[PDB]
Amino acid sequence: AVKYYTLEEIQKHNNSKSTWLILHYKVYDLTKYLEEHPGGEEVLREQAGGDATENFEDVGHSTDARELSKTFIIGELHPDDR
Ligand code: HEM
Numbered sequence: 551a552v553k554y555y556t557l558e559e560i561q562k563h564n565n566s567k568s569t570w571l572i573l574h575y576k577v578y579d580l581t582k583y584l585e586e587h588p589g590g591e592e593v594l595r596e597q598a599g600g601d602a603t604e605n606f607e608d609v610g611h612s613t614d615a616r617e618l619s620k621t622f623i624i625g626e627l628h629p630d631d632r
Pocket of ligand 1: 571593594602611613
């Protein structure tokens with residue numbers, strides 16, 4: 551099965567308690583990853599609640615980073631909002 555979230559609900563997860571962001575139509579909950587991210591937590595918080603695909607690709611993440619990111623997927627962006 552697959553959980554679909556709307557942009558409206560993803561937008562609410564941008565506070566000290568929860569940080570979600572979208573990458574290639576997939577929703578990631580990075581709340582517990584903020585302090586471990588080699589690129590820092592500031593760059594993640596800034597994109598919280600929205601689509602960070604372009605910024606993510608612009609830096610050119612390694613294969614290992616992409617493989618690791620899959621563990622944080624909680625669902626996908628609702629088809630109607632794409
Ligand atoms: C999906 C979660 C993400 C994971 C698992 C992740 C993982 C990593 C890892 C392992 C690195 C080290 C270099 C590499 O392996 O490519 C890195 C660097 C970096 N990441 Fe992420 N990242 C994620 C999301 C993001 C996002 C959304 C942004 C931008 C808004 C971001 C910005 C950066 C930057 C600026 C660096 C520093 C590159 C440098 O040293 O020049 N990351 N990330």
